Design a protein around this ligand. Structure first.
Ligand code: PLX
Lengths: 175, 70
């Protein structure tokens, strides 16, 4: 259905076998699903048609809010509170967007595991690597800030990691 | 409907917070400055504050005093 994007939530082509009855004995599943269609699917569809046409008589819209970019905490003077406030709010919005990205990848992983059946260990390695990469990045960004986290603490953690990386690289080059 | 009748937009709270933060930051820096100024005036005595009285020189009598050497 058009309600969601097929790229953000991909699905395989969903190949389905065809019924190949080896006997002439009547199965109960087809007859029972036919009476289910007749007794449930048809009135539900009629009610939905009525509701959808009532909705179509009254069509109105809502919009996704757009937020522009503001200078971040790295461009803010040591005590300038206005830019610090703007940067903190921007950082919090980015933090929530990152949480939602991790959620999307986790949903992909769960759907793959359920879909692949007994072959999930081999056929869901791509989603496992995607989640590994995204989880590593998210943990690097936000893992140990604790309650009372802030953009300044995140920047300090990144700076500490960058000093460690630069020292290691200089050691490796000079080793 | 609830948003339209009971609440306002985000810009209102955002900019009110900005104004409040400005007021509080200036108050904090003024408090630090005033403490330092008070310390300097009490130590050095050259300011308008902590001015302790000394004898008024208009009380001194400048006249011959029955003895030449004051
Ligand atoms: C199907 C319905 C689903 C929704 C149900 C809604 C239920 C409504 C009742 C619950 C209300 C929750 C409390 C809200 C209190 C604060 C609301 C307040 O902010 O609104 C003020 C108005 O207050 C309301 O008049 C209060 C209504 C109180 C009554 C609630 C319903 C129950 C009343 C029961 C009375 C019974 C009396 C005895 C009868 C026999 C005006 O706000 P204002 O600062 O301008 O806002 C500026 C932004 N503007 C300009 C966009 C608005």
């Amino acid at each position: 259905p058009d309600s969601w994007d097929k790229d953000v939530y991909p699905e395989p082509p969903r190949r389905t076998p065809a019924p190949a009855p080896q006997t002439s004995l009547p199965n109960p599943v087809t007859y029972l699903t036919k009476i289910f269609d007749l007794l449930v699917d048809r009135p539900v569809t009629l009610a939905r048609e009525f509701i959808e046409q009532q909705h179509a008589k009254n069509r109105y819209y809502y919009y996704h809010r757009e937020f522009r970019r503001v200078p971040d905490i790295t461009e803010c003077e040591e005590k300038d509170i206005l830019c610090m406030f703007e940067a903190e709010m921007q950082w919090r919005r980015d933090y929530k967007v990152d949480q939602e990205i991790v959620n999307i990848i986790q949903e992909r992983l769960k759907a793959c595991q359920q879909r692949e059946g007994e072959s999930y260990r081999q056929n869901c390695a791509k989603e496992l690597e995607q989640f590994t990469q995204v989880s590593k990045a998210f943990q690097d960004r936000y893992s140990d800030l604790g309650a009372h986290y802030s953009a300044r603490k995140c920047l300090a953690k990144q700076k500490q990691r960058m000093l460690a990386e630069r020292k290691a690289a200089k050691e490796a080059a000079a080793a | 409907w609830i948003a339209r009748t009971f609440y306002d937009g985000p810009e209102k709270n955002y900019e009110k917070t900005m104004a409040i933060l400005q007021i509080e930051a200036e108050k904090a820096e003024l408090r630090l400055k005033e403490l330092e100024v008070r310390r300097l005036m009490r130590a050095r005595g050259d300011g308008p504050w902590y001015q302790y009285p000394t004898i008024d020189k208009a009380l001194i009598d400048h006249s011959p005093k029955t003895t030449p050497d004051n």
